[PDB]
C-alpha cells in the first residue's frame, strides 16, 4: 500500500480569479545568474567564446562562489572567537583556542599534515565523488542518494492545518530558480568579500578592518 | 504607459491582481492564529495589570 494517498487530498486547490474563472498566467532573466539589476552582464563576451567555453565558466563561477561563501563564513566565525572544543593536534599540543582566528594566523598555525587532510578531501571530492556530469546541470555534483536538499518543480510544503502546497520553480523565496540565483549571487558577493578580507588583513591585520 | 528599468524589474510583483485561493482557503489557520493572538494579548495585559502574578517577575521599575 503506497503511503502517499493523503497528499492529494491535503493538496490546496489551484488558484483562480476572484470572479470565478480560471486565472490567466500572463522575462529576459532566463538563465540562473541573470538577475534584474544588470541582466546579462557580460563585458568580455564569454558567451560568444563557444558553448563549451561558456559551460566551463558557469561551473567555474559556481565552484569559485561556493568556496568563497564557505571561506567568508569561516573567517567571520573564527575571527569572532568561536572555536570547536578540544584539541586540533594532541601530538603538537595545539588546542583550538590557541590558533588565531585571523586568515593568515589560522593558515600558518594549522599544521601542514592537517592542511593535507583538507586538501585530499577536496581532491577526493573533485576527482571521484562529486564529479560534474556533462548531462547534469552546472554545479549539480552531488550524486543521488547522498541526502541533499533538493527543490524540484512542484515539491511539497506544508501549512498549519496539514494542507500541502506545491512550489513551482518561479515561486518567490521557495522555487528552485530563486535558490539557484541566491547561491550564485551570494557566491559572487562572497567572492569579492573573501579577497577583500584578505587584502584588508594584509594591510591592517584585521579582515573586516573598519569593523572591530 | 511608460516603461522604466525599475518598472520592468518590479513588473512580476504587481502581475497577480485578482488571484485568489478558491473557497475558504486558509481561513481556519488564520482563525487559530487570531485566537492565539487574542489569548497572548490578554496575557500581557493581565501581567501589566497585575491580574496575573508570575513566579519571579515583578511589574515595577528594574535596575540595570
Amino acid at each position: 500500500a503506497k503511503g502517499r494517498g493523503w497528499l492529494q487530498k491535503a493538496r490546496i486547490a489551484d488558484e483562480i480569479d476572484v470572479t470565478g474563472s480560471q486565472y490567466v498566467n500572463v522575462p529576459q532573466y532566463d538563465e540562473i545568474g541573470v538577475l534584474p539589476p544588470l541582466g546579462r552582464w557580460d563585458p568580455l563576451n564569454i558567451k560568444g567564446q563557444g558553448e563549451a567555453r561558456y559551460r566551463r565558466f558557469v561551473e567555474m563561477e559556481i565552484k569559485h562562489g561556493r568556496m568563497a561563501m564557505a571561506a567568508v563564513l569561516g573567517v567571520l566565525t573564527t575571527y569572532s572567537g568561536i572555536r570547536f572544543p578540544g584539541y586540533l593536534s594532541k601530538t603538537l599540543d595545539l588546542k583550538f583556542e590557541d590558533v588565531p582566528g585571523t586568515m593568515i594566523g589560522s593558515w600558518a598555525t594549522v599544521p601542514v599534515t592537517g592542511w593535507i587532510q583538507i586538501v585530499l578531501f577536496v581532491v577526493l571530492l573533485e576527482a571521484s565523488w562529486w564529479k560534474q556530469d556533462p548531462a547534469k546541470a552546472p554545479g549539480d555534483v552531488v550524486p543521488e542518494g547522498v541526502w541533499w536538499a533538493r527543490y524540484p518543480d512542484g515539491y511539497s510544503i506544508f501549512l498549519g492545518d496539514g494542507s500541502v502546497k506545491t512550489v513551482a520553480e518561479d515561486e518567490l523565496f521557495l522555487g528552485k530558480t530563486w535558490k539557484l540565483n541566491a547561491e550564485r549571487n551570494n557566491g559572487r558577493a562572497a567572492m569579492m568579500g573573501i579577497t577583500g578580507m584578505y587584502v584588508h588583513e594584509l594591510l591592517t591585520g584585521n579582515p573586516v578592518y573598519p569593523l572591530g | 504607459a511608460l516603461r522604466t528599468r525599475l518598472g520592468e524589474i518590479l513588473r512580476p510583483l504587481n502581475a497577480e491582481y485578482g488571484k485568489v485561493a478558491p473557497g475558504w482557503g486558509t481561513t481556519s489557520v488564520m482563525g487559530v492564529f487570531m485566537a492565539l493572538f487574542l489569548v497572548f494579548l490578554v496575557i500581557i495585559l493581565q501581567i501589566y495589570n497585575s491580574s496575573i502574578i508570575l513566579e519571579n517577575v515583578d511589574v515595577d521599575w528594574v535596575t540595570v
Binding site: - | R3, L6, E8
Partner: peptide, 30 residues
C-alpha cells in the same frame, strides 16, 4: 564615538551604492 562600527565607511559606501543604483536605473529601456 567616531570610528565606532566602521566610522564613516558604511554611510559613505551605502550612500554611494544608492546613488549608483539610481543612476544605473535612470536610463530608458531599449
Amino acid at each position: 564615538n567616531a570610528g565606532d562600527f566602521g566610522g564613516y565607511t558604511i554611510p559613505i559606501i551605502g550612500l554611494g551604492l544608492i546613488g549608483a543604483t539610481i543612476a544605473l536605473l535612470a536610463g530608458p529601456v531599449d
